[PDB]
Design a protein around this ligand. Structure first.
Ligand code: K
Ligand code: MG
Ligand code: MG
Ligand code: MG
Ligand code: MG
Ligand code: MG
Ligand code: MG
Ligand code: MG
Ligand code: MG
Ligand code: MG
Ligand code: MG
Ligand code: MG
Ligand code: MG
Ligand code: MG
Ligand code: MG
Ligand code: MG
Ligand code: MG
Ligand code: MG
Ligand code: MG
Ligand code: MG
Ligand code: MG
Ligand code: MG
Ligand code: MG
Ligand code: MG
Ligand code: MG
Ligand code: MG
Ligand code: MG
Ligand code: MG
Ligand code: MG
Ligand code: MG
Ligand code: MG
Ligand code: MG
Ligand code: MG
Ligand code: MG
Ligand code: MG
Ligand code: MG
Ligand code: MG
Ligand code: MG
Ligand code: MG
Ligand code: MG
Ligand code: MG
Ligand code: MG
Ligand code: MG
Ligand code: MG
Ligand code: MG
Ligand code: MG
Ligand code: MG
Ligand code: MG
Ligand code: MG
Ligand code: MG
Ligand code: MG
Ligand code: MG
Ligand code: MG
Ligand code: MG
Ligand code: MG
Ligand code: MG
Ligand code: MG
Ligand code: MG
Ligand code: MG
Ligand code: MG
Ligand code: MG
Ligand code: MG
Ligand code: MG
Ligand code: MG
Ligand code: MG
Ligand code: MG
Ligand code: MG
Ligand code: MG
Ligand code: MG
Ligand code: MG
Ligand code: MG
Ligand code: MG
Ligand code: MG
Ligand code: MG
Ligand code: MG
Ligand code: MG
Ligand code: MG
Ligand code: MG
Ligand code: MG
Ligand code: MG
Ligand code: MG
Ligand code: MG
Ligand code: MG
Ligand code: MG
Ligand code: MG
Ligand code: MG
Ligand code: MG
Ligand code: MG
Ligand code: MG
Ligand code: MG
Ligand code: MG
Ligand code: MG
Ligand code: MG
Ligand code: MG
Ligand code: MG
Ligand code: MG
Ligand code: MG
Ligand code: MG
Ligand code: MG
Ligand code: MG
Ligand code: MG
Ligand code: MG
Ligand code: MG
Ligand code: MG
Ligand code: MG
Ligand code: MG
Ligand code: MG
Ligand code: MG
Ligand code: MG
Ligand code: MG
Ligand code: MG
Ligand code: MG
Ligand code: MG
Ligand code: MG
Ligand code: MG
Ligand code: MG
Ligand code: MG
Ligand code: MG
Ligand code: MG
Ligand code: MG
Ligand code: MG
Ligand code: MG
Ligand code: MG
Ligand code: MG
Ligand code: MG
Ligand code: MG
Ligand code: MG
Ligand code: MG
Ligand code: MG
Ligand code: MG
Ligand code: MG
Ligand code: MG
Ligand code: MG
Ligand code: MG
Ligand code: MG
Ligand code: MG
Ligand code: MG
Ligand code: MG
Ligand code: MG
Ligand code: MG
Ligand code: MG
Ligand code: MG
Ligand code: MG
Ligand code: MG
Ligand code: MG
Ligand code: MG
Ligand code: MG
Ligand code: MG
Ligand code: MG
Ligand code: MG
Ligand code: MG
Ligand code: MG
Ligand code: MG
Ligand code: MG
Ligand code: MG
Ligand code: MG
Ligand code: MG
Ligand code: MG
Ligand code: MG
Ligand code: MG
Ligand code: MG
Ligand code: MG
Ligand code: MG
Ligand code: MG
Ligand code: MG
Ligand code: MG
Ligand code: MG
Ligand code: MG
Ligand code: MG
Ligand code: MG
Ligand code: MG
Ligand code: MG
Ligand code: MG
Ligand code: MG
Ligand code: MG
Lengths: 64, 51, 75, 71
RNA sequence: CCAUAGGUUAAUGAGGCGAACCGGGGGAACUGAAACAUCUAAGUACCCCGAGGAAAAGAAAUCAACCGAGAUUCCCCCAG
RNA sequence: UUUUGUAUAAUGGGUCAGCGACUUAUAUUCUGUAGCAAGGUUAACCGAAUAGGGGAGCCGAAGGGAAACCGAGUCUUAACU
RNA sequence: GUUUAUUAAAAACACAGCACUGUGCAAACACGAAAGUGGACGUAUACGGUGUGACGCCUGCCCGGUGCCGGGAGGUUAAU
RNA sequence: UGAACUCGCUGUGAAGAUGCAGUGUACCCGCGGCAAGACGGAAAGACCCCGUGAACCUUUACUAUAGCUUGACACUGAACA
RNA sequence: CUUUAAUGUUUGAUGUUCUAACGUUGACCCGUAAUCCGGGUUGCGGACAGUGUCUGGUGGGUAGUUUGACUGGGGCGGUCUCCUCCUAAAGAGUAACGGAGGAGCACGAAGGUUGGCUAAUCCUGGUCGGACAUCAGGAGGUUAGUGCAAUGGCAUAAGCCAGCUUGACUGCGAGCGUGACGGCGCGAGCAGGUGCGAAAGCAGGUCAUAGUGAUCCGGUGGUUCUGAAUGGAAGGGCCAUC
């Protein structure tokens, strides 16, 4: 049978041109008023997955 | 505990707001700071309001 | 026991040493109080972190009335 | 249901008319694709009249430099 | 009271067995979830009923997208 | 064999002969290799001979953005040296 | 008298007697999707449950807690 | 029942030695006896701990649920207060 | 509007009665050699009881399960995140059920910024006024103070008063530090728009390091996004926040 993609992983990562994956930063859902705006600003844009935890992502979604 | 959290809402402009903490028991009156609205791109009187 | 607690270690100290070339923005010293002070082309942030404000070589000096350690940069 | 038509694979249809249904019969884009776009992928020679397709600003320069019209 | 229930013989048929496949009526749990209860295993194993050489479906109150197709079943993609 | 460590008085075996444990299918990625190369390749299917058809499709040659969308750029933002 | 067939025969179980308690007979209760059986072809001096355990002398106080029984105003309260 | 040409001692040693070191002692081989040792044989310790193991049992643990119980609607109609 | 009288007109919980559904494990008759069952006359009940679907309660009667780890064996006790000091061997880091303490906030001024100030403890002298209130002087030199523990810091003061104020600002961010990662921190400069100061400038919270929790799932407001035929809409997304 075909490999099933880990769907939850498909909904949190997106494949970039070179091969890596963009993902949204954690700590930006609730409890925002106590956070400084400089954090919240820096957490807003999408960010790349580190080389340590890349193999875990590549495994759980083999298609794209 | 004790010190609750409030929503400073803009007067002149869109419903953009700031959020801060406030002690309600010691300071029963309302805030009226003059903060920057970025939708209008202007400093405006921000009044206190509830969530 | 009664005790057995401790905080995580803060990695404070002189990061870039005297004579070392640094780029503008490079943190030179992470520390609590001003054990070292900001001299020429060096900033001093809210954490009392001394950082390079210009590209150059780090220079430690011992200058002033009270004989304090200053960190300067010279291009 | 949108496509990204590479300019190199454009003069492969019917002389110089690329509506969409003609472009589909050339097997360049899929069957269930109603919107399409011609991007600057490079290399045109023949004059191609591109009618209906949304065309890119870089490709509009090339297609017209080769001789082809648009719309 | 009228008829009905019932009782008699005759005509025709049914009954039981059998490998899988088939359609229905019921229908688990171990297991996986690194525990577990939603969920999974799975309408699976099993039980029952009724067929036939096949059985089910099936000639749109079906899709589609302003273009069009035209019952059903089966195979390959669509597509993990 | 298992262990920091076993002549160990820790495990297992009386001996012999035979059998006895990294497989298979499908997807996916990487390496070698071969073909052809901005292309490569066909599936079910027909055909009867592993040929030949069949390019439906798939992957690649374009990315950025949540998306509309724009596109060698694009997102960010009122705009970005 | 009974009991751990096969390491325990006992002070354990049962026992007559005792009390509480349910049950008005299509009884309570029990087995059973149900039909239906038993209780009982009995009917409160009967039947089931529970504790206690011949007999003798006795069986004191507490109803805050938990249960049970009764009460029905008020508060709270589902489907509809 | 790994294979043995299967002694004592004091040491040493996976920390209690027939097997190692140093020693001492001992011709080869049965038969009857005794049971101190071969951590003798017998049952993959029952104690103990572990395993996100099992089972049963308990309860004012969680979640359900048969039973019992309350209403509403259905089977379910008719007058009078 | 209040307050209430007579008549019409709105339903529904009552409380008797009534008989034809329904019940009969009452009597008799028949099918019939039959305590079964059915049917028929009846008598008693009687729209109750009972059953189906909803529903609230009750429910170890039964079922499925859970019931942490560390641990100088396990249990009992204690502990689990965060900050400070030592242990820590003069970079960083560094364990133990090692040694000592803290935190789970506070604050619209206790932030910003311009202008000023300078502290403890004494010794004297002085109305009550004492061992200690306030005043005056001296001697002291930070022995204090810093919203909260400790360490490092603070006189240019970051300590203490004062005047104006909202930089506790939105978009960014060269570059660094620290993380296995999720993350966490520092940051000149830039764009916009502000306070303060005559300006030089300063200001993206507070002397610094504690004051805290991921995702998912929903809630709230916004939005040049999507909008399963088409217009909308719901639901999404994106922003802000709970
Ligand atoms: K280490
Ligand atoms: Mg790519
Ligand atoms: Mg960062
Ligand atoms: Mg694909
Ligand atoms: Mg203004
Ligand atoms: Mg410790
Ligand atoms: Mg520390
Ligand atoms: Mg530590
Ligand atoms: Mg930790
Ligand atoms: Mg700063
Ligand atoms: Mg095609
Ligand atoms: Mg362009
Ligand atoms: Mg016959
Ligand atoms: Mg015949
Ligand atoms: Mg038949
Ligand atoms: Mg038959
Ligand atoms: Mg079948
Ligand atoms: Mg079948
Ligand atoms: Mg079947
Ligand atoms: Mg079924
Ligand atoms: Mg299960
Ligand atoms: Mg299970
Ligand atoms: Mg499991
Ligand atoms: Mg498991
Ligand atoms: Mg378990
Ligand atoms: Mg079935
Ligand atoms: Mg069967
Ligand atoms: Mg059958
Ligand atoms: Mg045939
Ligand atoms: Mg036939
Ligand atoms: Mg048929
Ligand atoms: Mg049919
Ligand atoms: Mg039909
Ligand atoms: Mg018809
Ligand atoms: Mg027709
Ligand atoms: Mg038709
Ligand atoms: Mg037509
Ligand atoms: Mg046609
Ligand atoms: Mg078709
Ligand atoms: Mg072993
Ligand atoms: Mg080993
Ligand atoms: Mg072992
Ligand atoms: Mg060991
Ligand atoms: Mg040995
Ligand atoms: Mg050895
Ligand atoms: Mg051995
Ligand atoms: Mg030994
Ligand atoms: Mg031995
Ligand atoms: Mg052993
Ligand atoms: Mg072992
Ligand atoms: Mg072994
Ligand atoms: Mg052995
Ligand atoms: Mg393998
Ligand atoms: Mg492939
Ligand atoms: Mg490759
Ligand atoms: Mg080539
Ligand atoms: Mg070809
Ligand atoms: Mg064939
Ligand atoms: Mg064809
Ligand atoms: Mg062809
Ligand atoms: Mg073709
Ligand atoms: Mg590729
Ligand atoms: Mg652009
Ligand atoms: Mg622009
Ligand atoms: Mg007996
Ligand atoms: Mg007997
Ligand atoms: Mg006996
Ligand atoms: Mg016995
Ligand atoms: Mg027996
Ligand atoms: Mg036995
Ligand atoms: Mg016995
Ligand atoms: Mg005995
Ligand atoms: Mg006896
Ligand atoms: Mg006895
Ligand atoms: Mg007894
Ligand atoms: Mg009595
Ligand atoms: Mg009595
Ligand atoms: Mg029952
Ligand atoms: Mg009954
Ligand atoms: Mg009887
Ligand atoms: Mg007793
Ligand atoms: Mg007496
Ligand atoms: Mg008593
Ligand atoms: Mg009472
Ligand atoms: Mg009383
Ligand atoms: Mg009670
Ligand atoms: Mg009661
Ligand atoms: Mg009561
Ligand atoms: Mg009442
Ligand atoms: Mg009441
Ligand atoms: Mg009420
Ligand atoms: Mg109410
Ligand atoms: Mg020895
Ligand atoms: Mg020796
Ligand atoms: Mg020797
Ligand atoms: Mg000797
Ligand atoms: Mg002998
Ligand atoms: Mg003997
Ligand atoms: Mg022995
Ligand atoms: Mg033994
Ligand atoms: Mg064992
Ligand atoms: Mg035990
Ligand atoms: Mg045990
Ligand atoms: Mg566990
Ligand atoms: Mg475990
Ligand atoms: Mg429950
Ligand atoms: Mg009613
Ligand atoms: Mg009705
Ligand atoms: Mg009647
Ligand atoms: Mg009557
Ligand atoms: Mg009868
Ligand atoms: Mg009869
Ligand atoms: Mg008779
Ligand atoms: Mg009888
Ligand atoms: Mg009868
Ligand atoms: Mg009858
Ligand atoms: Mg009847
Ligand atoms: Mg009758
Ligand atoms: Mg009556
Ligand atoms: Mg009822
Ligand atoms: Mg219920
Ligand atoms: Mg309860
Ligand atoms: Mg249980
Ligand atoms: Mg079970
Ligand atoms: Mg268990
Ligand atoms: Mg368990
Ligand atoms: Mg337990
Ligand atoms: Mg535990
Ligand atoms: Mg443990
Ligand atoms: Mg331990
Ligand atoms: Mg343990
Ligand atoms: Mg212990
Ligand atoms: Mg404990
Ligand atoms: Mg140290
Ligand atoms: Mg150190
Ligand atoms: Mg060192
Ligand atoms: Mg360590
Ligand atoms: Mg503590
Ligand atoms: Mg707070
Ligand atoms: Mg002020
Ligand atoms: Mg300040
Ligand atoms: Mg002096
Ligand atoms: Mg001090
Ligand atoms: Mg202190
Ligand atoms: Mg200040
Ligand atoms: Mg100050
Ligand atoms: Mg002013
Ligand atoms: Mg103001
Ligand atoms: Mg003012
Ligand atoms: Mg803040
Ligand atoms: Mg911070
Ligand atoms: Mg501008
Ligand atoms: Mg500006
Ligand atoms: Mg101004
Ligand atoms: Mg000014
Ligand atoms: Mg200026
Ligand atoms: Mg400042
Ligand atoms: Mg402050
Ligand atoms: Mg502080
Ligand atoms: Mg802090
Ligand atoms: Mg969760
Ligand atoms: Mg959501
Ligand atoms: Mg809503
Ligand atoms: Mg809108
Ligand atoms: Mg936009
Ligand atoms: Mg729309
Ligand atoms: Mg739209
Ligand atoms: Mg709209
Ligand atoms: Mg559709
Ligand atoms: Mg239309
Ligand atoms: Mg629509
Ligand atoms: Mg319109
Ligand atoms: Mg929405
Ligand atoms: Mg939403
Ligand atoms: Mg955007």
């Amino acid at each position: 049978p075909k490999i099933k993609t880990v769907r939850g992983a498909a909904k949190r990562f997106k494949k970039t041109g070179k091969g890596g994956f963009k993902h949204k930063h954690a700590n930006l859902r609730h409890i925002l008023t106590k956070k400084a705006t400089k954090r919240k600003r820096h957490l807003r844009p999408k960010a790349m997955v580190s080389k340590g935890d890349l193999g875990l992502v590549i495994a759980c979604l083999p298609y794209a | 505990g004790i010190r609750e959290k409030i929503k400073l809402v803009s007067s002149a402009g869109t419903g953009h707001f700031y959020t801060t903490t406030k002690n309600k028991r010691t300071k029963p009156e309302k805030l009226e700071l003059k903060k920057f609205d970025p939708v209008v791109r202007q400093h405006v009187i921000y009044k206190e309001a509830k969530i | 026991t009664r005790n057995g607690r401790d905080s995580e270690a803060k990695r404070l100290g002189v990061k870039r040493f005297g004579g070392e070339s640094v780029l503008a923005g490079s943190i030179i010293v992470r520390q609590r109080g001003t054990k070292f002070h900001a001299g020429a082309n060096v900033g001093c942030g809210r954490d009392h972190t001394l950082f390079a404000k210009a590209d150059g070589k780090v220079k430690f000096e011992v200058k002033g009335p009270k004989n304090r350690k200053f960190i300067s940069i010279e291009a | 249901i949108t496509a990204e038509i590479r300019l190199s694979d454009l003069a492969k249809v019917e002389g110089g008319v690329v509506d969409l249904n003609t472009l589909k019969a050339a097997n360049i884009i899929g069957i269930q694709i109603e919107f399409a776009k011609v991007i600057l992928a490079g290399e045109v020679t023949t004059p191609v009249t591109v009618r209906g397709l949304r065309v890119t600003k870089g490709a509009r320069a090339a297609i017209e430099a080769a001789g082809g019209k648009i719309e």
